[PDB]
Design a protein around this ligand. Structure first.
Ligand code: WKY
Lengths: 179, 245
């Protein structure tokens, strides 16, 4: 088993903390959803290769420009997250997060991940967003942003239902193994 | 950690830690407030434990078993004794507040109603000045520590054998040298997240809501001061590179 490092970036409302928790427990917490995530080393076998994948969150570091880059050294794969219920989180991807990750993690693959995909067809979400002349992020808008920023790929998932969560981390492992 | 505290904080939440007959006696809002306070203490207990691995397992083991050049161990683990002192004292205060709140006849049933004042004290006056001074120094020495560790692991046979030996047990899975350094750097920015969620469930007593609002402001002031006092030190950097920053 080789050791690889994964870091998740994105706005506070993107659901990055919840994604790491649901993956590490293989369960959406039934009694208490933790506020924070410390770290975790996942045992993953992707396409016959065994990897120890260390997971790191950047939540709480968003307003601290000198503390936040300290999470980046020797990262092997970046998960760049946005929330499908928040077009404002997707707009922050190309000219805030992308140039920062390209500067501190040169040549590291980036997977653009659309979180909370279960809210795309949620009536309360559609009613609330319509008040600001908005709607849930469409799948093609996600793919176009991923193409534009030079991402390795585009994926979607729901931490609430677990759908697509395992796939994201297996693909991130494959990306971390590439030359 | 010591067994007594490990067992008190073994459950995934406060609602699972206390007896089911005690849980039934409280309002939903109180259970929500208590679950977040339990998470703050449980993660503080784990953070103090990370500092003990760095001081006792790593630092002292290298001093007693290896023949490194002088100033090498200090370069790998900057400010670890000062950090351990700050956080062991804070954890002591948190655990004493839980202990005083225990029902007679019980070692697990308690409710903490007055956390705000403890958080104001930790994040104000001399203790805040020492936290600010220690993290500004630690975080500015973070990149230098990782680089020094990588150099030693790749070139020193006895150092590599030492690391592989003490990190082999499963309980050390998440706690290699570089992992400990980042766990410590990230700790300070977890505080506003935990405190704001505690404040969310602390409106029942107006004085407690006010105390937590004050504590949140003090934590953010500390973070802004530490963030503004960081400049990564680099082994080999020349004065010209520094004054042309
Ligand atoms: C596996 C892992 O997460 N290692 C690490 C942690 C922090 N900083 C740098 C590195 C390489």
């Amino acid at each position: 088993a080789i050791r690889k490092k994964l870091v998740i970036v994105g706005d506070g409302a993107c659901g990055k903390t919840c994604l790491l928790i649901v993956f590490s427990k293989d369960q959406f917490p039934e009694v208490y959803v933790p506020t924070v995530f410390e770290n975790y080393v996942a045992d993953i076998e992707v396409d016959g290769k065994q990897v120890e994948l260390a997971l790191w969150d950047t939540a709480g570091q968003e307003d601290y420009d000198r503390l936040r880059p300290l999470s980046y050294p020797d990262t092997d794969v970046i998960l760049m997250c946005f929330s499908i219920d928040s077009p404002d989180s997707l707009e922050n991807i190309p000219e805030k997060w992308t140039p920062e990750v390209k500067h501190f993690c040169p040549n590291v693959p980036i997977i653009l991940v659309g979180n909370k995909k279960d809210l795309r067809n949620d009536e309360h979400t559609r009613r609330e967003l319509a008040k600001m002349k908005q709607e849930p992020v469409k799948p093609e808008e996600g793919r176009d942003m991923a193409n534009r920023i030079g991402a390795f790929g585009y994926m979607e998932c729901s931490a609430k239902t677990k759908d697509g969560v395992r796939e994201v981390f297996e693909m991130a492992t494959r990306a971390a193994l590439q030359a | 950690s010591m067994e007594m505290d490990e067992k008190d904080f073994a459950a995934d939440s406060w609602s699972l830690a206390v007896d089911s007959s005690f849980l039934q006696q409280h309002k939903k809002e109180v259970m929500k407030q208590q679950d977040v306070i339990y998470e703050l203490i449980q993660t503080e207990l784990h953070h103090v434990r990370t500092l003990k691995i760095m001081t006792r397992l790593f630092r002292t083991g290298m001093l007693e078993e290896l023949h490194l050049e002088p100033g090498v161990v200090q370069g790998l683990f900057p400010c670890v004794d000062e950090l351990s002192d700050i956080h062991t004292r804070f954890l002591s205060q948190l655990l004493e507040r839980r202990r005083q709140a225990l029902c007679p006849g019980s070692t697990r049933n308690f409710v903490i109603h007055r956390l705000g004042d403890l958080l104001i004290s930790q994040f104000s006056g001399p203790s805040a000045e020492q936290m600010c001074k220690t993290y500004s120094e630690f975080c500015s020495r973070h990149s230098k520590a990782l680089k020094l560790y990588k150099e030693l692991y790749a070139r020193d046979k006895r150092f590599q054998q030492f690391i592989r030996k003490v990190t082999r047990p499963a309980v050390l899975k998440r706690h290699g040298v570089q992992e400990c350094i980042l766990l410590v750097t990230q700790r300070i920015t977890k505080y506003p997240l935990l405190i704001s969620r505690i404040l969310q469930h602390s409106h029942g007593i107006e004085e407690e809501r006010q105390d937590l609002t004050t504590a949140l402001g003090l934590v953010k002031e500390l973070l802004s001061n530490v963030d503004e006092g960081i400049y990564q030190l680099e082994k080999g950097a020349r004065l010209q590179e520094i004054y042309n920053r």
